[PDB]
């Protein structure tokens, strides 16, 4: 018990959102379709409630209320994402620049600043242009790099006078693993035997190609930022990565080496190229010629290409050793030879949230942060996402739905765990809660609510503060 005053001076507290999950106005103000527009409309069976982001939380119209809601809590900063196809309706410069899209984000930024809230902007939060998907399969083509670079530069030119904090990509792990290994997220590609039962793809090659291309697009974009923009705009640029914490299934050395392989595959996949200039050893060994290779020039470009690392933490998994399968079912999912579970001998690692993958384990938050400290030279970190969900329940009266004690408990323990890690030397500068509002939770649609504020989808998307909102107001005092 635990308040802002417990944290170092200058420490930043905020909330996070993303364009597709919040904005709505999908076909409004000249916005082009993204792969998630396509994905939700053509494959509604892949969304738990067959829903889409057409309206979402209507932030495109209601963003002033959002800023008001953050301000009432005393938030320092807002993490949001720009929709690529709101700026470049068909992905590329030559396809035309959408003026009305630029106006919207200017309005959002100006509104935030008029109320003392600093904007942290994610360039890519999965809403990849459909036109570039159709043209060359999006991130499976090296052509994506320049189109991304051109998109990024328009953001630097239009917004960089006021925006001082930039994130290139959000959770490339999630994007690549779910989009191309399991095919459960857009663009919904995978091997036929894999979970998404996709019509096209290869779970053993495509995840790696996609993410390789994201890393190159990231590095190119950082380089560009530092070369042309950083001198006069004096902002910072980084990237947001997820990691679970991995507890060895038992005390055996092989289970310990599995947990190490799990983290190498989920997290080191991006961290090692960024810190050491190449993919993890276990990745190059186990994946072989299915993993692309950096040229010497590419390695130089990727190494050290960041001002900070955004870190997302939600849960822990047990990690157990797995024999090679051995043969013709190569998938990124199994490539690690680590079997991931949240339950061990019928005992869940922590209480299970509404998301079936989300188990409450505050300990691992600290563990992850210290792992980063000890193994990656303690880089500047912001916690770009942390949070939990409850079910969307149409039978509960409104006032019962606002009582999110489980969320308060989640934040209480995780903030304590974050504090202890900081006190033990973790180079952490800020913290963003996922998320400000209930929103479109991807393949879970609206069946699940992550918000500190309730959104009534059946009453014009009206916002209501949950109990946790009040809790954060207290916490954020002075
Ligand atoms: O399945 N996963 O391993 C996994 C990881 C991060 C995930 O999601 C992350 O955190 C939030 C809550 O989940 C999302 O709304 C964010 O947009 C995303 F960054 C998701 N996901 O959104 O479905 C899934
Ligand atoms: Zn509206």
Per-residue three-class SS string for the chain: CCCHHHCCCCCEEEEECCHHHHCCCCCCCCCCCEHHHHHHHHCHHHCCCCCCCCCCCCHHHHHHHHHHHHHHHCCCEEEEECCHHHHCCCCCHHHCCCHHHHHHHHHHHHHHHHCCCEEEEEEECCCCEHHHHHHHCHHHCCHHHHHHHHHHHHHHHHHCCCCCEEEEEECHHHHHHHHHHCCCCCCCCCCCCCCCCCCCCCCCCHHHHHHHHHHHHHHHHHHHHHHHHHHHHCCEEEEEEECCEEEECCCCHHHHHHHHHHHHHHHHHHHHHHHHCCCCHHHHHHHHHHCCCCCHHHHHHHCCCCCEEEEECCCEEEEEECCCCCCCCCCHHHHCCEEEECEECCEECCCECCCCCCECCCHHHHHHHHHHHHHCCCCCEEEEECCCCEECCCCCCHHHHCCCHHHHHHHHHHHHHHHHHHHCCCCEEEEEEECCECCCCHHHCCCEECCCEEEECCCCCEEEECHHHHHHHHHCCC
Strands 462-465 and 453-456: antiparallel
What b/e sequence results for 407-431 when a residue is b if at least 16 CB atoms lie within 10 Å of its CB, and e otherwise?
bbbbbbbbbbbbbebbeeebbbebb
For residue 433 the two structure tokens come to 């809660």
What is the distance in A from the centroid of ligand 1 to the CA of 93? 30
- Phi, psi of 384, deg, nearest 5: -85, -20
Residue 173 counted as an annotated binding residue: no
Q: Count CA atoms within 13 Å of residue 385 on its CB side.
A: 25
171 annotated as belonging to a binding site for a ligand: yes
Query: How many A from CA of 177 to the centre of ligand 1?
Result: 12
The gap from C-alpha 444 to its chain's centroid, in whole angstroms, comes to: 16
In the chain, the number of structural domains is 1
Ligand nearest to the CA of 25: 2
Q: Closest ligand 1 atom to the C-alpha of 125?
A: 17
Six token digits for residue 314: 């939600």
- Between CA 268 and CA 274, with CA 270 as vertex, the angle to 5 degrees is 105
Q: Which residues pair with 317 in a beta bridge?
A: 246
Q: In terms of DSSP bridges, do strands 316-321 and 245-248 run parallel, antiparallel, or are they unpaired? A: parallel
Beta bridge partners of 347: 344
Q: Specify the residue with its C-alpha closest to ligand 1, atom 18.
A: 171
User: What does DSSP say about strands 12-16 and 77-81: parallel, antiparallel, or unpaired?
Assistant: parallel
Backbone angles phi and psi of 430, in degrees to 5? -170, 170
Closest ligand 1 atom to the C-alpha of 355?
Answer: 13
26: CA distance to ligand 2 center in Å?
Answer: 11
Burial of 288 (0-12, 13-18, 19+ CB in 10 A): exposed
- Across 447-471, b (16+ Cβ under 10 Å) vs e yields bbbbbbbbbebeeebebbbbebbeb
| Distance between CA atoms of residues 166 and 238, nearest Å | 6
For atom 3 of ligand 1, which residue has the closest CA? 174
- What dihedral angle (degrees, nearest 10) is formed by the CA atoms of 139, 142, 144, 147? 180
**Distances 120 to 41, 103, 239 between C-alpha atoms, Å:** 30, 18, 11
Compute the half-sphere exposure of residue 301: CA atoms within 13 Å on the CB side of its CA: 17
Ligand 1 midpoint to CA 450 (Å): 10
The pocket of ion ligand 2, defined by CB under 5 A, consists of 58, 61
Q: Is residue 447 a contact partner of residue 427, using CB atoms and an 8 Å limit?
A: no
Residues 6 or more apart in contact with residue 426 via CB below 8 angstroms? 369, 370, 372, 373, 378, 381
d(CA 137, CA 141): 6
Dist. CA 436–CA 22, nearest whole Å: 10
Nearest to 188 by CA among 143, 133, 241, 135: 133
Q: Distance from CA of residue 344 to its chain's centroid? A: 27
Among candidates 417, 412, 418, 450, which has minimal Cα distance to 431? 418
124 marked as part of a ligand binding site: no
**Smallest CA separation from ligand 1 atom 15, residue:** 441
Phi, psi of 381 (to 5 degrees): -120, 140
Q: Phi/psi class of residue 432: alpha, beta or left (left: φ > 0; alpha: ψ in -120 to 50)?
A: beta
* Dist. CA 327 → ligand 1 center (Å): 30
Radius of gyration of the chain (CA): 21
Q: What is the CATH number of the domain that holds 3?
A: 3.20.20.80
Which protein residue has the closest C-alpha to ligand 1 atom 2? 174
Q: What would the two tokens of residue 200 be?
A: 């096209």
Output the six-digit token pair for 242. Answer: 């997820």
- Cβ contacts of residue 96 below 8 Å, gap of 6+? 88, 89, 90
Active site residue 133: no
How do strand 236-242 and strand 308-312 relate by DSSP bridges? parallel
List the end-to-end C-alpha distance of the chain, in Å, as a whole number.
Answer: 15
Q: How far, in Å, are 46, 54, 61, 95, 168 from residue 23 at the CA level?
A: 21, 8, 8, 23, 19
What is the residue with the minimal CA distance to atom 5 of ligand 1?
Answer: 174
Strands 118-124 and 165-170, sheet pairing: parallel
Q: How far does residue 439's CA lie from ligand 2's centre (Å)?
A: 14
Residues with CB under 6 A from ligand 1: 18, 21, 170-171, 174, 242, 312, 357, 385, 434, 441-442, 450
**Is 385 one of the annotated active-site residues of the chain?**
yes
Instruction: Say how many Å lie between the CA of residue 17 and the centre of ligand 2.
Output: 17
Nearest to 262 by CA among 247, 284, 240: 247
Residues 6+ away with beta carbon under 8 Å from 2: 412, 415, 416, 419, 475
385 annotated as ligand-binding: yes
181: containing domain:
1-478
- Quickly tell me which residue has 């990656």 as its tokens: 376
Ligand with the closest atom to the CA of 22: 1
Q: Among the bound ligands, name the one nearest to the CA of residue 59.
A: 2
Angstrom distance (rounded) from CA 392 to CA 451: 11
In this structure, is the dihedral angle defined by the CA atoms of residues 207, 364, 401 and 431, taken in order, positive or negative? negative
Contact between 176 and 292 under an 8 Å Cβ cutoff? The reply is no
Q: Match 């459909």 to its residue by tokens.
A: 130
**Which residues have CB under 8 Å from 191's CB, separation 6+?**
198, 201, 202, 203, 204, 329, 331
Contact 338, 319 (CB under 8 A): yes
Q: Are 245 and 365 in contact (CB under 8 A)?
A: yes
Among protein residues, the one whose CA lies closest to atom 13 of ligand 1: 441
Q: Is 111 annotated as a binding residue?
A: no
- 374 a known binding residue? no
Buried b (16+ CB within 10 A) or exposed e, 58-85: bbbebbebbbebbeebbbbbbbbbbbbb
23 Cα–ligand 2 center, Å: 9
CA separation (Å) from 83 to 29, 76, 104, 105, 301?
12, 23, 11, 9, 26
Torsional class of 148: left (φ above 0), alpha (ψ -120 to 50), beta (otherwise): alpha
The reply to whether 21 sits in an annotated binding site is yes
Q: Which residues pair with 167 in a beta bridge?
A: 122, 238
Residue 195 contacts by C-beta under 8 Å, 6 or more apart in sequence? 182, 183, 184
Measured distance CA(107)–CA(82) in Å, rounded? 13
Residue with tokens 């109990």: 467
Which ligand ends up closest to the CA of 172? 1
| Cis upstream peptide for 133 (omega within 30°) | no
Shortest-distance atom of ligand 1 to CA 185: 23
| Shortest-distance Cα residue to atom 20 of ligand 1 | 174
Of the listed ligands, the closest to the CA of 63 is 2
Question: In this structure, are residues 443 and 428 in contact, taking their beta carbons and an 8 Å threshold?
Answer: no
- How many residues are there in the chain? 478
Question: Residue 84 annotated as binding?
Answer: no
- Among 158, 171, 194, 390, the active-site one is 171
Alpha carbon nearest to ligand 1 atom 23, residue? 442
């Amino acid at each position: 018990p635990v308040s802002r005053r417990s944290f170092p001076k200058g420490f930043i507290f905020g909330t996070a959102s993303s364009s597709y999950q919040y904005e709505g106005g999908a076909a409004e103000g000249g916005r082009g379709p993204s792969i998630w527009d396509t994905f939700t409309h053509q494959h509604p069976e892949k969304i738990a409630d067959r829903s889409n982001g057409d309206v979402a939380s209507d932030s495109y119209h209601l963003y002033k209320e959002d800023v008001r809601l953050m301000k009432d809590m005393g938030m320092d900063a807002y993490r949001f994402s720009i929709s690529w196809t709101r700026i470049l309706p068909n992905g590329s410069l030559r396809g035309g620049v959408n003026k009305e899209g630029i106006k919207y984000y200017n309005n959002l930024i100006n509104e935030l600043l008029s109320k003392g809230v600093q904007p942290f902007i994610t360039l890519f939060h999965w809403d990849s242009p459909q036109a570039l998907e159709d043209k060359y399969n999006g991130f499976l083509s090296p052509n994506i790099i320049n189109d991304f670079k051109d998109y990024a530069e328009i953001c630097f030119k239009e917004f960089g006078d006021r925006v001082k904090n930039w994130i290139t990509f959000n959770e490339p792990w999630t994007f690549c693993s779910n989009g191309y290994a399991t095919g459960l997220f857009a663009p919904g590609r995978c091997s036929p035997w894999e979970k998404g039962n996709c019509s096209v793809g290869d779970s053993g090659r495509e995840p790696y190609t996609a993410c390789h291309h994201q890393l190159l697009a990231h590095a190119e974009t950082v380089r560009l930022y530092k070369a042309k923009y950083q001198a006069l705009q004096k902002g910072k640029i980084g990237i947001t990565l997820v990691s679970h914490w991995f507890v060895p299934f038992s005390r055996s050395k092989s289970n310990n080496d599995a947990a190490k392989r799990a983290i190498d595959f989920m997290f080191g996949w991006f961290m090692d190229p960024l810190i050491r200039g190449d993919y993890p050893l276990s990745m190059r060994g186990l994946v072989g010629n299915r993993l692309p290779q950096f040229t010497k020039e590419q390695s130089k470009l990727v190494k050290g290409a960041f001002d900070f690392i955004g870190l997302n933490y939600y849960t822990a998994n047990y990690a157990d050793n797995l024999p090679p399968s051995n043969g013709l079912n190569n998938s990124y999912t199994t490539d690690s030879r680590a079997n991931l579970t949240g339950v061990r001998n019928g005992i869940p690692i922590g209480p299970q949230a509404a998301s079936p993958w989300l188990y409450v384990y505050p300990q691992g938050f600290r563990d992850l942060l210290l792992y980063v400290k000890e193994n990656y030279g303690n880089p500047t970190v912001y916690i770009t996402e942390n949070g939990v969900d409850e079910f969307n329940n149409k039978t509960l009266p409104l006032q019962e739905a606002l009582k999110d004690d489980a969320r308060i408990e989640y934040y209480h323990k995780h903030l304590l765990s974050l504090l202890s890690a900081i006190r033990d030397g973790a180079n952490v500068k800020g913290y963003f809660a996922w998320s400000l509002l209930d929103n479109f939770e991807w393949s879970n649609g609206y069946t699940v609510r992550f918000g500190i504020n309730f959104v009534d989808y059946n009453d014009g998307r009206k916002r209501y503060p949950k109990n946790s909102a009040h809790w954060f107001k207290k916490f954020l005092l002075k």
